Structures are given as C-alpha cells and as structure tokens.
Structure 1
Amino acid sequence: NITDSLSNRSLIVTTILEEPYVLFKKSDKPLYGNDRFEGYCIDLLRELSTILGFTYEIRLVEDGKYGAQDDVNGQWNGMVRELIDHKADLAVAPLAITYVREKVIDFSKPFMTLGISILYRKPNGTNPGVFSFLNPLSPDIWMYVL
C-alpha cells in the first residue's frame, strides 16, 4: 500500500474556465495560487481545506474542456485525458455523470442535482397601429377599391 506515502502530499486542482461567477478576481495585483479564482468550486475547496488541509494548486488547464473519446481516436481527451495521463492520477474533477464517466472516473457522491431545461427569450408580442391598412393582402386591391 502507498497509504504511508500518500499522506502530506500536495493536491493538484485541475478545473476549467467555469460558470461566470467562477472567474479571476478583479484586482490590480495578479493574486494567483489558491486565490486564482473565486466561485462555488473555490468555496468547496475551502471546505476541503477545512476537511483535508492539503496544499491545492488551483490553476488553469491547457485544453479547457471535459472532452470525450472520438470514433477515429478512441481516447477520452480533455480533462479525462488529464486524469489518466498522470497529471492527476487520482480522478478529481467537478463534472456531470455521463455514460462513460462512471468507469473512467473513480467518482463520489454528486453534490449538485440538476435537470436539463430550455432557455428562451421573453417576446413582446405586440404589433399596435393601423394594420387593417397593412394586411398581408396587397394595397393594390385597396387602391382598386378606392
């Protein structure tokens, strides 16, 4: 077992450019490291610092996607490729449950429960004015009536 060696080890945080409330903080000083981002994953990392206390490298990634496998490649690219090509061999990433992420990610209890819905703009739906003069019939027949 490597349980005697896994203790007191640095933890690598590999996330992507997340939800628009999870971004770089607006300051003149480029506060990086554990203060690189502020967001709900950062709040969960603060909770994990209260749980573990290990050093976290909250840093960006070179791909920026939770990629999947291709029919011409067969290799799950992106952050799944990050978690299998020894950048972080322990699969630690906040993402959704897919058909293949059950077996390619070791995984835990999902903290967030959500659905899939439709986003649409609210329409005004108002066309006021004299539109009996502006029928889809041509005004050639209107001046014929005149």
Structure 2
Amino acid sequence: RSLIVTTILEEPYVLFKKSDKPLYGNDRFEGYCIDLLRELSTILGFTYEIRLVEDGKYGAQDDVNGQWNGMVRELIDHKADLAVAPLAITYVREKVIDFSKPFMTLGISILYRKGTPIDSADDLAKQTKIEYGAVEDGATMTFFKKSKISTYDKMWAFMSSRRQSVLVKSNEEGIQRVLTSDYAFLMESTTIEFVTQRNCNLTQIGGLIDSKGYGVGTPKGSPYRDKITIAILQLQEEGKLHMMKEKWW
C-alpha cells in the first residue's frame, strides 16, 4: 500500500505547484521536500500519498493536558507513516516520535534590516525599542522558553510578556513584520537564506544561536526510520541534496 505522508505548506520546502489547469494528488505539490520525498521513494521503492496536516502545525505539547498537535500528533496516532517537512529534530519530539538522520542542518538566527548597529542577540536583549519574536510554539520559541543562558532567558522574558504582540503564527507573518515595522525575527537560518536571497534589504544578524537538523519523522518504532536514514545518506553523498538546495534557494 501507499505510505501516508503528512506535510505542511512552507516556501520553498512545500508549495502548491502553479498550473493553468487543475492539479490532483501528489502533482499538486512542489518544493525541496517534495523532491526529497520523490528521491526517497525512488531509492526505497514505496508509493505515497501527500496530505497537508489538518491543523496546520508542526508539533508541540500543551503544558496542561500534555497533548501533542500537528504532524507529530499525526505520527503518534499512526494517522501518517512519514512526516516530510522542515521539521526540526528536537529533544522533546525525539521522546515521542522517531526521526531519520538530518537531510539539512541549520540553526536559529536573526532576520533584520541591513545597515543597523544591531549585531547579535545580546544587542536585542539589552533594549526594548526594537521588538523581536518568533513563531509561537515552534522549535525556535521552545529554545528560548527553556534556555538558562542569561541573554536568551531575558529574550524569553521579553517575548512572553508581549506574546500577543511579538509572537507570530508563521514565517510569512514574521517576515512581513520585519518588512513593515521595526522588528527583528528569530527564525531558522535555512529559511533566512531563502528570504535574504529575495529581499536585498534584509540580512541575517549574527551567527547561528544553536544547531539542529531537519529529519523525516516516523511513528516511534517505525522500520522506515532507518531505511530513510540510509537513503538520505545516499542522496547526500551523490550530491543530490545539494542540487535540490541550489534549485529551491
């Protein structure tokens, strides 16, 4: 049978393919993660059906009820066989689902304007005039929520106190805020690179604040996890992942 693959719209990883005529099935989608999935299927010999996660979320756990949502929740409940998306491999997620080895490596950094005196997270933390934030309940926000590093703890105190005003619901919302207010956006370096290639007034500020990878998610114990790892390593060694990144970035 075909594997059910859960994913989510996020440029340039997953988007709706443009066509003058209606599109159906997997043909509706394109992007880096779609090429990846195609290449994985070519190596491993499975067929698949792409489905957008209904709740539009990656996967985080609620504090009170301990319930998961998003693509992670779909894998937990065995409603999908794989999740293929820019899904960060994190400690809390690894506790509840399995991940392939990374197909991309990245870190949190800062998206802001060029030509300013701001050069690091510490510069942001020490002031309040320039607002800053992150996608609510994502891996980036979770990093700040849990950090014991003085600088990042202060940034979390700032963001948490202004939740409604500085946390956003998507990368697109955060980017639009950098573009239309005095705002710096804490976001993943791979997506920053995409943005800065297309917006000459924007830049990454400072280096990477942490390090993580994106991996393909599976339900805990899935036999596909290790198979997908091996295929990913093959794709990397063949230069195919690099070609795919060049194509979409």
TM over 0.5: yes
Shifted more, 19-28 versus 105-114: the winner is: 19-28
Q: In structure 1, the residue corresponding to 2:49 is in which secondary structure?
A: strand
Residue 33 of structure 2 corresponds to 41
Identity %: 92
Retained in 1: the 8 A contact 2:35–2:244?
A: no
> 1:16 aligns to what?
8
Structure of higher RCO (CA pairs closer than 8 Å, 6+ residues apart)? 2
Separation of aligned partners in 1, 2:42 and 2:86 = 18
1:49 CA displacement: 2.1
Contact 1:36/1:58 (<8 A) preserved: no
Higher helix share: 2
Is the CA contact 2:5–2:49 (under 8 Å) kept in the aligned structure 1? yes
Gaps of 5+ in 2: 115-216, 222-238
Structure 1 residues 140 and 27, CA gap change in structure 2 (3 angstroms): closer
* SS of corresponding position for 1:14: strand
1:139 aligns with 2:245: yes
Aligned residue pair count: 129
Distance 1:31 1:114, change over 3 A: same
**C-alpha distance 33-91 of structure 1, shift in aligned 2 (>3 A):** closer
Distance in structure 2 (CA, Å) of the matches to 1:99 and 1:26: 37
Q: Is the 8 A contact 2:3 2:82 kept in 1?
A: no
TM-score calculated relative to the size of structure 1: 0.69
Cα distance in 2, alignment partners of residues 30 and 140 from structure 1: 28
Larger radius of gyration: 1
TM-score (norm 2): 0.42
- What is the Cα deviation at residue 22 of structure 1? 2.7
Shift of 1:65: 0.6
Summarize the Cα distance change of 1:71–1:41 in structure 2 as closer, same or farther, 3 Å threshold: same
Once the two structures are superposed, residues 77-128 of structure 1 have per-residue CA deviations (whole angstroms, 9 ceiling, x without a partner) of 1111111122125666651111211221121211101121111112xx9999
Q: Is the 8 A contact 1:36 1:59 kept in 2?
A: no
| Higher percent of residues as strand | 2
Give the CA deviation at 1:139.
58
Paired with 1:111 and 1:39, the residues of 2 have a C-alpha distance of: 14
Mapped contact 2:7–2:53 kept (Cα < 8 A) = yes
Q: Distance in 2 between matches of 1:87 and 1:61?
A: 10
